[PDB]
Amino acid sequence: TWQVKANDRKYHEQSKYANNAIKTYKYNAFTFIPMNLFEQFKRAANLYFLALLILQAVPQISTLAWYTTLVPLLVVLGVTAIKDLVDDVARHKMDKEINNRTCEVIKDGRFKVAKWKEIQVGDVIRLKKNDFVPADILLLSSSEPNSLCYVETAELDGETNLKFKMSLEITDQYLQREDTLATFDGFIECEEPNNRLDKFTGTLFWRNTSFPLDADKILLRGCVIRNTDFCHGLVIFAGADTKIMKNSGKTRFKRTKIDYLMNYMVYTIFVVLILLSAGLAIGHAYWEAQVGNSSWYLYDGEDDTPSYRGFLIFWGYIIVLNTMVPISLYVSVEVIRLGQSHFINWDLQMYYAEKDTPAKARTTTLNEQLGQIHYIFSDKTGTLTQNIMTFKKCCINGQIYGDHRDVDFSWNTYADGKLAFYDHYLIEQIQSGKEPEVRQFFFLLAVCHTVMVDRTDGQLNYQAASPDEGALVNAARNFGFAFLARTQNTITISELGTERTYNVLAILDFNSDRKRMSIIVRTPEGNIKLYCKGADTVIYERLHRMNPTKQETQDALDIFANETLRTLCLCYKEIEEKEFTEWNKKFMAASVASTNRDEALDKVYEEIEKDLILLGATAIEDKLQDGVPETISKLAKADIKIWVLTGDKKETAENIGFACELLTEDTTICYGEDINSLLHARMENFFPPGGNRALIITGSWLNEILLEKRRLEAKKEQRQKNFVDLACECSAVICCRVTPKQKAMVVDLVKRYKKAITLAIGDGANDVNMIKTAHIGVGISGQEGMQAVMSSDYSFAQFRYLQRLLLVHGRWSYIRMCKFLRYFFYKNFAFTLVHFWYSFFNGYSAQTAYEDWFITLYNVLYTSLPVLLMGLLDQDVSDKLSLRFPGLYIVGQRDLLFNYKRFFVSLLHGVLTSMILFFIPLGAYLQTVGQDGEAPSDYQSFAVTIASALVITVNFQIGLDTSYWTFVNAFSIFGSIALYFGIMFDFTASNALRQPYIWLTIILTVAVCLLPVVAIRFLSMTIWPSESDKIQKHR
Amino acid sequence: KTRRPDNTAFKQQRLPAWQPILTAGTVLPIFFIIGLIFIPIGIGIFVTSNNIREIEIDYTGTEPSSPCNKCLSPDVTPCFCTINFTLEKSFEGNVFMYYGLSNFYQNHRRYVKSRDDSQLNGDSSALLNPSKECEPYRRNEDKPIAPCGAIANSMFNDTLELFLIGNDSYPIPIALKKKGIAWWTDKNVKFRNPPGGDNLEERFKGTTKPVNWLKPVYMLDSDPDNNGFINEDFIVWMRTAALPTFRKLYRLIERKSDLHPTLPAGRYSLNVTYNYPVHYFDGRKRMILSTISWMGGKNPFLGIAYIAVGSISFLLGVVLLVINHKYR
């Protein structure tokens, strides 16, 4: 049980309590070099190349130089180490900035500065306005009355609206002064640290009395104090026990599915390589037993038994056939990934003009996974919306306004300019004042609210706990009715540039169940007005019979509802002088606790708001980013399922669901209570919600569904499995009121119980956990903190740019990768297996069929450039056709271009090509090549024929593969062939290529290798044309 | 973030390009023109190869009931073997005399590498210091072997002489040239004697002969042009073959001054000195006589390969044409 003693530096120093410094980095200045263990072991190819480096080091078993493998090996490990060094070094700069944030602490005697590191459990602190909370503190006092503090929890949930927080009454009236805080000695026995944000169980033992605590009294670390000059508190949790830091996940090293596929499809090559070398080694043991011992010309001293000779070349055939898993593949992929990533940065169609913020591929290793996405988990506010909640229309009195009929806003000096109101009839009517109901409507908006004024540097900025209320007051200010200021007992309003102060005498509270709020404002003349504002349903239940505008306003509400705009009916009253005086005495009696204070308040509240008169309803538009509704439908056609994980309340999350067209009139909403019946029903027994197609679950209900002994774990796994299957079959799932860790929990749930590839997109510190958890993490630019941007693989400002990331850059990146891998495995299997076929004709003695130089430069100069430009400049369809035809994305989601079937087909193609490249020349050299004094039929000329036929064959195979023949593609393909012949024609072996029979053989081995490919490729597309083929055919 | 990305063709992935589609109007021709070009070339190769006269005598004498078995157990070191063959059709033009060896793996790894390339080039530094690469024959007892390595040690040292059995039954010797039977590059670039001096004796001082060679590299041939590392027979042997069965050029029978054929049809007897033992590893020495052809040599496999490939390509296009017609 956590125990906190105020201003006792050595309470626990007598491990459990953590100092208030944080660490998100992974490496120190020394243990970074041991990062190789996370590269070597995770990727077996790295281990295998290390084996070759060790294998080629010992001269007793060697057939190739070991420097040719160390240099590529360092590049493969070097780039990934430098790539991960900058990533961690960046994490060190941000951690230092957070740690070096300054605060104030009660040291011995007084408040003196102490950085965030120096904060510890049970250490009283003082925080000013617009200052970050350093640790989960207990509010003890504040500069404003009743020790009341408003804090913006922009990181716990990605919302700018202020949160109400109240300190204990006992601490309110004693710890106001600095001196009393120093001598304060309060003992707290609270709950152990956990990731829950909205719940806090504990007590404060002080002055021989225990005071229970609640989440309202506890400020959290990832919050900023606002609208209060200063506040005091003592830390409860610190450093890593802070609820923000417990709502975080590890920075796992993210690898592509293709990278995982190559792991299992490179184990296969190792097994074949061992079997081939072991198979040939056994053959040489028998050959040396019979033919090698009696062959006097082969005697070389150093008598080795035939078993030992076979043993020695088993390694000798490992180096000879090592190119089956070439190291050049993992060196070229670095170029392919880096080049593909830089196309995202250079994209002008993903460049945001007014913010001047082009996209950024912050992780180049995951380029091809953008073509694999099955799910998208998106934050709501800031990602789908602009965080701008404007006031769009108002049905004041009976007539609807704001319909572009016939603004400067210069007539009032208080016009901030945020509003973009276009209609001019409203402006003319207000100044003319021919209808008093217009003035009362906007005056109400500046009266019935809880908005707060700033007046910072002469700017009348507004901050409010309800974003809708802030928009209304901001809307009212633009139309002349400015909310100047407010003290406890009176409220000041500027009407058309004229000062006007009212003495408020009652403020009805706002509650979720209440669905409305009201304010009794006493006019200076003497009139009493009960201004009211609330939802249309509750408001219409409490109108006077005289109201003739009920139906007309109701019609307007439908028009606003069709446009997906929130609506709030406005009303007032004309309470008499004596009428309220009796009620005021009753109302004061209701302020006391009495028994509960709920029924007493709830009762009297009902009779206050009866017999009202209706002005109309407002239309608050929660603005969406441009192209968001088009994006969600565009990606829906790609068979991508979009989930909205948001920290906003249910009604706000549901409303944006309809604005984005995630939810429609067809969809029937399944709420938390409805699901629990289904999940329990399945336990006591695909899911019916497959027909419902929508899912709106609060974060509180996720805990009940998740339920967060061996038998208990069995239910845990089954209960998690049931929810995911139910959730995954719905068209849209919206998870509201979810903590930052609950955002990553759902991403983990989908990944684990569906094996789906997930994309997490969002902005702000709220979404960092799911951005770090999903396979692909996207960070929307715009947040000043730059916390989701820095932890995301990719980052661009708008949401509509997700169309190009997935359908253009991710679709091509998958196609280009798969074409690269399949050909690169082909060109080396064909190249390296000629040593296997030649084994039967040289005593299984591990003699290469090519000259030594051709072994080194095959993957450097002769076949390196054509495949790199195919991995960077290959487009099946243009970008427009990629976005015009979203269905092509399904190719990557289903893993069609790279599999075991497609991998072994490349091996089969490589094996046969090697068979043809060796056995067609063999027929032409077994008996007689063009023979005379100056003639081939050497070993050098035999090696030249296979090398020449191999270079042209593979460089002609890539020519078939590249469907986008840029001039560089043509130059590289023909330049690689021309370069090969240029090198070996003095810029010996040039004698072989200067005869007809050698060229006739080379012309044959090339055609026999390629003509079956042309026939097979032509038949495959004709009989079974792919979706890209159809569009190309109909292009 | 940063300024606007530059607008260029490469960066925006809008480089000019041509998209090639494997339309039936393009694959079908390249399956018929190829099937139409390879057949005439396949007939040209096949018809010309069959017009090249060739007689090949296998004189290893492994099988009893042959007049050459006596040399399989050479009690007396100089063994002479004689075999009679008949030329039914007179050879025309230049006639090339090879020697063949079967089941003789000159492409073994331990054998192919077993030479010192630097020494053969005339590297005086390596002349008396052969590399580790020719380890088993680096030094005989104390001083180094000049042609080090297994490749030079196991040189083919049989002597072949051609005799024409004329109408008078008196054997007529046939002129055989031992010059110009190696690559021009090999004589003048790859293989060279050690620099300095005028006599080959002083150049090869302090260097023993290979253990298997009867005489050192001093006097491989009488002519100074054809002795030393620049000897034609030595050069031709070191030029390693690619497969176990190979044949290496041995002599040339240049065009006769008179109009009559170089080797008129009749009875011929080959007088061969049996020196090279191969029967231990089931080898088979052979002598081959071939006549020059304008288009290289005699290669039937390429002929049938083009008739097969030229025919197969023609059939595939027809099958593709039929399949295209159904799916047109």
Ligand SMILES: CCCCCCCC/C=C\CCCCCCCC(=O)O[C@@H](COC(=O)CCCCCCCCCCCCCCC)COP(=O)([O-])OCC[N+](C)(C)C
């Ligand atoms: C017109 C004529 C064109 C043709 C000529 C010029 C083409 C040059 C252009 C491109 C190709 C450049 C060569 C890269 C070769 C790939 C790596 C490789 O194969 O490793 C090889 C060695 O390689 C080395 O030792 C040097 C590696 C240096 C890394 C350079 C990164 C690539 C830069 C790219 C710049 C992109 C620029 C993009 C521009 C838009 C060995 O690999 P392996 O054989 O598979 O290993 C198996 C055997 N082993 C285990 C025993 C070792």
Ligand SMILES: *[C@@H]1O[C@H](CO)[C@@H](O[C@@H]2O[C@H](CO)[C@@H](O[C@@H]3O[C@H](CO)[C@@H](O)[C@H](O)[C@@H]3O)[C@H](O)[C@H]2NC(C)=O)[C@H](O)[C@H]1NC(C)=O
């Ligand atoms: C032609 O070449 C062959 C090689 O194929 C020569 O036969 C080899 O001759 C050498 C000696 O000249 C043999 O080496 C050793 O000889 C001693 C006797 O001096 C003997 O005691 C050793 O046991 C060993 O044999 C070598 O063994 C032998 N080859 C084989 C396979 O046994 C031949 O001498 C050459 N002839 C001419 C005329 O150049």
Ligand SMILES: *[C@@H]1O[C@H](CO)[C@@H](O)[C@H](O)[C@H]1NC(C)=O
């Ligand atoms: C081969 O020819 C020689 C000499 O011409 C002769 O002595 C010998 O009998 C001949 N052998 C056969 C089998 O005819």
Ligand SMILES: *[C@@H]1O[C@H](CO)[C@@H](O)[C@H](O)[C@H]1NC(C)=O
């Ligand atoms: C074959 O050559 C040898 C060596 O010159 C010679 O002695 C012999 O008479 C020749 N003729 C034969 C063996 O018929």
Ligand SMILES: [Mg+2]
């Ligand atoms: Mg957000």
